[PDB]
């Protein structure tokens, strides 16, 4: 099984005890480290800031301790949006400029591959034709990686892509059989399933649906999403399940109605370290629990939630990671991807469950072993 772990460039910029640097990632913990994010300039991949080059060096230097460790560079993300990718895939000339810049960039900065994270082809303004053009880009990029490998007599660069977790978004943007042929891995975005706009508490990444989830809500769970990708032609061993190291928060309409599916006023206030309304890192949730929040493990969805007064959080813990890891193995999936590793308890001081408790649960249960680490 694979165990991929994201490192986000902004994690080192969080205040005081929340700051986490890439050089402090345990090199034996994951099979792949993914750096979020690279940007684009004139149809060429590039760094977002010159300081990212120092992060690339620290991240890639971990391969000197774990010689089997692989590193990927992620381009895109929610904030970047669809427009740069739409322009880049629009012509063969722009795709060639991009593919050539990727090979050159990955090799010069010692990355083992690229993670495409276009959010999303075919939606958010991206036209219907981008479903076909994204598949063309992926085929052409895989072919160029094979040709570079043969020309230089070195292992081929890896090619991965994120995959939407929302059915309508999957339908309008992904030619699943073609993408599965050319990609090494598909990182399925099995998280942010809390449906913030419906006015009820919802889980971030439940394994199974709530019996109260009706219609489109019934597909907002790991089991339903992965089943959809498999039913539509994705290779099971190429599927990498998204494991969030954070939760989503809500302000309860009534503090006495504190279960899943209960009425909400708004997303919860930003955390001291992550500073994003409606989100708390796993390390911040540990503080919330230590400061008196009531912890409930919902067996119907196989995920926890916690509440304190009118503040409610739906998240993942050691137990939910354990149960999803067994389900992953039972379903012959390719592995897991921790999103983001920097929101797990990287120091061991917030949760007192040792360093990286969520990720360590996956390393142990997915039998991740490197010959270089024994």
Numbering used by the authors: 1 to 374
Anything the authors wrote about it?
Ym1 (encoded by the Chil3 gene) and Ym2 (encoded by the Chil4 gene) are CLPs belonging to the glycoside hydrolase family 18 (GH18) and are unique to mice, with no known human orthologues. However, Ym1 is mainly expressed by macrophages, neutrophils and a subset of circulating pro-repair monocytes, while Ym2 is produced by lung epithelial cells, which could have discrete context dependent benefits.
Individual crystals were harvested from the BAL fluid of mev/mev mice (carrying a defective protein tyrosine phosphatase Ptpn6 gene) developing crystalline pneumonia and C57BL/6J-Tg(CAG-Gal10)Bla mice (transgenically overexpressing Gal10 from the ubiquitous CAG promotor, manuscript in preparation), sensitized and challenged with the allergen house dust mite (HDM). We had hypothesized that the crystals obtained from the BAL fluid of C57BL/6J-Tg(CAG-Gal10)Bla mice were CLCs containing Gal10. However, crystallographic characterization of these crystals revealed that they are Ym2 crystals. Moreover, X-ray crystallographic studies showed that a native in vivo isolated Ym1 crystal and a native in vivo isolated Ym2 crystal are structurally similar to each other, which is not so surprisingly as Ym1 (Chil3) and Ym2 (Chil4) are two closely related proteins sharing 95% nucleotide sequence identity and 91% amino acid sequence identity. The low root-mean-square deviations (RMSDs) establish structural similarity. Here we show by ex vivo X-ray crystallography that Ym2 also crystallizes in vivo and that the phase transition of soluble Ym1/Ym2 to crystalline pseudo-CLC states leads to profound immunostimulatory effects on innate and adaptive type 2 immunity. Given these similarities, we assume that Ym2 crystals most likely will stimulate innate and adaptive immunity and act as a type 2 adjuvant, similar to Ym1 crystals, although we did not formally demonstrate this experimentally.
